[PDB]
Design a protein around this ligand. Structure first.
Ligand SMILES: CNc1cc(Nc2cccn(-c3ncccc3F)c2=O)nc2c(C(=O)N[C@@H]3C[C@@H]3F)cnn12
Length: 261
């Protein structure tokens, strides 16, 4: 049921460690095709079920195209080792970047990024395909857009190991990006989008970050509302996305409409 390119280990060179993802270590690399800069996502030693969930993500990303979705080149297998080969994006994860640049990222810059992320998720909605890991960490900054007469440009990363295969402990760690219906469909990405807008508004500090797993879990079980930004028109949008009833979240047609005025 899955389709993606098999990458020969001879085709790839591993360079410096960039950090950890869910069950992964991410490295700068080279792919010989020309010697293309890429990232290598090396899966932890894993049960077959996690390996499958990894391949499922490679299959998903290999059959979609959008200018605000990161490219997946394929999967390298090296006996028990699984390596996803994906797009290197120049300025790296947005959450890190916003925390580093805190105090000089204008609202207009943030509204461009919200619009680009909405155009990626509008495309996935129309395809009826779930990302399931929309968050600042998975938004990659291709163009800075701070210089006068420039605009930023983002790429949404592959979601990594499918949410469906992760432990309850890992799902609780992803609150408040995790849709509440996923604690125990594309509607989950509407919640994830809303949480990511708060994260962007708060310069890479998402709500409930300091809170213990039990306190994050109770927040959802009690259906506490997440904070609203002081921009009332953006607050209306985030509050509609962060609605507990999945069927009450707005379409990406409505979201894009609201962001473009
Ligand atoms: C410059 N290019 C680049 C850098 C980078 N860096 C990181 C990858 C993973 C973790 N951390 C990371 N570690 C520890 C603390 C904070 C972090 F952000 C990193 O800094 N990641 C990527 C990716 C990519 O797809 N990354 C996957 C989605 C995760 F970020 C594509 N380009 N690129």
């Amino acid at each position: 049921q899955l389709s993606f390119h098999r990458v020969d280990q001879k085709e790839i060179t591993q360079l410096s460690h960039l950090g950890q993802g869910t069950r992964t270590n991410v490295y700068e690399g080279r792919l010989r095709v020309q010697e293309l800069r890429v990232v290598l996502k090396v899966l932890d030693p894993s049960h077959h079920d996690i390996a499958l969930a990894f391949y499922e993500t490679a299959s998903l990303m290999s059959q979609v195209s959008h200018t605000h979705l990161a490219f997946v080149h394929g999967v390298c297998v090296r006996g028990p080792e699984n390596i996803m080969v994906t797009e290197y994006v120049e300025h790296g994860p947005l959450d890190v970047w916003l925390r580093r640049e805190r105090g000089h990222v204008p609202m207009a810059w943030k509204m461009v990024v919200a619009q680009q992320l909405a155009s990626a998720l509008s495309y996935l909605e129309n395809k009826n395909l779930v990302h399931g890991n929309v968050c600042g960490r998975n938004i990659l900054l291709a163009r800075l857009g701070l210089a006068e007469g420039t605009s930023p440009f983002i790429k949404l990363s592959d979601p990594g190991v499918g949410l469906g295969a992760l432990s309850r402990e890992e799902r609780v760690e992803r609150i408040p990006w995790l849709a509440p219906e996923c604690l125990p469909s594309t509607a989950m990405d509407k919640w994830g989008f809303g949480a990511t807008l708060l994260e962007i508004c708060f310069d890479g500090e998402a709500p409930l970050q300091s809170r213990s797993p039990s306190e994050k879990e109770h927040f959802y079980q009690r259906q506490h509302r997440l904070p609203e930004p002081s921009c009332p028109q953006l607050a209306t949008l985030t509050s509609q996305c962060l609605t507990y009833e999945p069927t009450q979240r707005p379409s990406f047609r409505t979201i894009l409409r609201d962001l473009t005025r």
